Structure formats: C-alpha cells, structure tokens
C-alpha cells in the first residue's frame, strides 16, 4: 500500500496473508474454512496465516493453517487477468473471534463513489522499494467504468473496477495482490493489478467480486 496509514493490529480481522516461506499476496476469510485472494496468486505449499499484524514476528493472535486445496477460476486468463480470483480451503477451521473473522460476500455490486479499505503488507513506495512488517490501510473509493477504461485503454473487462486516486500518490502495490477492498462490511475486490503503483491516471484494478459469488457459494457446497 503507498500512501497508506497503520491499520493497527488486529483491526482488519479478515485480512489474512498468504505464507509458502515468506509473505508472497493477501487474502479475505470468508468463513472457518475458506480464503478468497487472486488467481495470479496460485501455487503450491501454500500456509494461510491469521490473527496478523507484524508478518515478522509471532505476536499472539495467529493461526497458521496450511492450505488443503486451492481452487483457481475456471475462466482465469493469466494475460489479461480476466477473472482473477481463486478460493483456498484450509485443513482446519479457523477459531473465529474479534481478531479473526470472516468478511461477508456482496449481494449487489457497489457504485462508482463508494468509499472502501483496501489493505496488505505489499510495497509503500511508488518509486523505490520497501516493505512493511504491519498491515498497512488505505481509504479509497470505487471509480466509474468509463474513468477505468480510459484510464487503460483495451484492458478493463466486466469483472474488473479501478479504485483511488486519478491524481496518483495513494495505491496498492506490488505483494498487496489478492487482498481485500472491504466497502460497507462486503468483500467487492481483490487486489489484482496496475501499472506500477500510485502513479498519475492508473488507478489500482480489481477483482469484481460481486459477478463471483454464485460460483464461490457453489464451490464452497461442494469442496
Ligand atoms: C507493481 O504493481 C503491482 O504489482 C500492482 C499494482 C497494484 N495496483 C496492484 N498490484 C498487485
Ligand atoms: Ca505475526
């Protein structure tokens, strides 16, 4: 996140982050059992971690709890990231408190203006490079289609939404991917992509996650 603040620890109880050895993208629990993050995301030997603030240091509200199947969009395109979300399952339940907690699925879509956090541990530098040990937040809002289109000519699908600042200097970045943008209590993004970060008219893009939820309930019910 550039142009963030500290969330404070514990304070996006949903936000998980993803571990195969180090902190590689984010994630949304979205019940005891489930993650939803980013398609472009996957791999193998996946560690989902909970309960975190510092990523560097066990601080007491953790859980870690390997991955048992990750389960990509079957309609993921990794050129374009059209579709860009996969559901990981967790070999055990997660215990739900005030420190860990799932987020709740959209039942309608939000409008271009509604204000969201998005969150992660990724790149606080538009320029340079350095990474935070906390979560770090970032209060943006949904921009419209036609703003996200020609902000990026050829490349906004309709499972796609930019969310920011035109003007630059507040974004997600680079090890955010896959985390969420929380907009009225119900998960509406996944950190997807963008070009670079925090730059003038390129807003970060993200997983329309409202077109998911038929397939993410289904799937659930069934895995
Ligand atoms: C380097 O840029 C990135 O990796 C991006 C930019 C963001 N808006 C979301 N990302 C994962
Ligand atoms: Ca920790």
Sequence with gaps: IVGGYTCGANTVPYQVSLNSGYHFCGGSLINSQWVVSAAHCYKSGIQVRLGEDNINVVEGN???????????????????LNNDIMLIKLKSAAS??????SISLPTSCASAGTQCLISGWGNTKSSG????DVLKCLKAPILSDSSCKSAYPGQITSNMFCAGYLEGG???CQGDSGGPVVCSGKLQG???????C??????????????????????????
């Design 62 to 80: 953790e859980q870690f709890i390997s991955a048992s199947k990750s389960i990509v969009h079957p309609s993921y395109n990794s050129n374009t």
């Design 170 to 172: 507040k974004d997600s």
């Design 129 to 132: 490079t350095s990474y935070p």
């Design 96 to 101: 739900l408190n005030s420190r860990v907690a």
């Design 198 to 223: 925090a730059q003038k008219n390129k807003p970060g893009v993200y997983t329309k996650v409202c077109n998911y939820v038929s397939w993410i309930k289904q799937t659930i019910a069934s895995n």
């Design 190 to 196: 996944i950190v997807s992509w963008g070009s670079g």
